[PDB]
Amino acid sequence: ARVAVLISGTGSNLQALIDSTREPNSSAQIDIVISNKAAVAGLDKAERAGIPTRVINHKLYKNRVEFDSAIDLVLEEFSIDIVCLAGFMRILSGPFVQKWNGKMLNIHPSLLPSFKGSNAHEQALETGVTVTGCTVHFVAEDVDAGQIILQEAVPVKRGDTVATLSERVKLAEHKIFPAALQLVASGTVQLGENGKICWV
Numbered sequence: 347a348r349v350a351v352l353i354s355g356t357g358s359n360l361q362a363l364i365d366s367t368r369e370p371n372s373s374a375q376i377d378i379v380i381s382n383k384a385a386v387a388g389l390d391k392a393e394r395a396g397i398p399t400r401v402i403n404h405k406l407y408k409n410r411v412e413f414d415s416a417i418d419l420v421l422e423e424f425s426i427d428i429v430c431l432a433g434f435m436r437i438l439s440g441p442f443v444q445k446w447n448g449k450m451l452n453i454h455p456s457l458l459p460s461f462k463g464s465n466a467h468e469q470a471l472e473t474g475v476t477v478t479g480c481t482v483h484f485v486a487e488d489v490d491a492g493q494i495i496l497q498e499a500v501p502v503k504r505g506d507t508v509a510t511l512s513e514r515v516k517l518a519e520h521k522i523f524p525a526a527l528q529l530v531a532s533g534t535v536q537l538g539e540n541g542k543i544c545w546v
């Protein structure tokens with residue numbers, strides 16, 4: 347399976363995905379890395395890995411459709427099979443999500459369905475949970491509500507901040523994102539006919 351990784355910043359999940367997909371038994375290959383923001387560190391990690399990069403500045407498009415369309419163009423250029431959202435912080439338009447239904451994965455730093463949205467760690471700390479975690483799911487049109495592929499629980503420790511909680515959660519993210527990509531790339535897991543996870 348040919349994989350595009352979309353990023354908005356540091357790219358630690360990108361790097362974990364790079365590492366896993368270079369294992370001999372990997373069913374995924376990362377053929378293109380796309381950032382909506384230049385100068386972000388994830389672009390350096392891709393270039394150190396020999397992976398082509400493209401920056402598509404969402405700020406230069408009238409609307410989301412033209413912007414997504416620009417992304418879709420690059421995906422087609424690289425004959426992409428699978429899209430990984432790895433710290434990509436833009437919401438994608440309906441038609442783009444539909445076109446890639448069952449082919450696009452996102453990592454979210456909570457145990458969905460808890461703490462959807464952009465500040466999961468803040469929400470988890472304000473709520474006072476002692477267990478949080480992270481989720482890889484298929485991207486559906488309903489944000490952070492697509493079908494769940496893998497999750498891993500992570501303890502919240504007393505005194506945790508966004509800084510320390512997200513550091514601990516990311517170690518789990520770097521485990522289940524590569525595992526989830528391999529499940530999809532190998533065809534072991536698909537978005538089933540009925541839209542629920544299908545294990546083959």
Ligand SMILES: Nc1nc2sc(CCCCc3ccc(C(=O)N[C@@H](CCC(=O)O)C(=O)O)o3)cc2c(=O)[nH]1
Pocket residue numbers: 431434435436437438439440443452463464485486487488489490491492
């Ligand atoms: N339809 C659909 N699209 C998508 S994209 C994705 C990948 C992860 C979603 C991240 C997210 C959560 C909330 C926001 C948000 O408010 N972002 C602002 C800009 C934020 C900034 O600048 O940092 C915007 O979108 O302008 O971002 C998952 C997903 C999905 O599950 N469904």
Ligand SMILES: NCC(=O)N[C@@H]1O[C@H](COP(=O)([O-])[O-])[C@@H](O)[C@H]1O
Pocket residue numbers: 354355356357358359360388432433434435453454455463464465466480512516519
């Ligand atoms: N709503 C999506 C969201 O909160 N994404 C989160 O952004 C970080 C990106 O880190 P990275 O750039 O080092 O992979 C990750 O922690 C991921 O869970």
Ligand code: NA
Pocket residue numbers: 442443444446447448449450484485486
């Ligand atoms: Na999708």
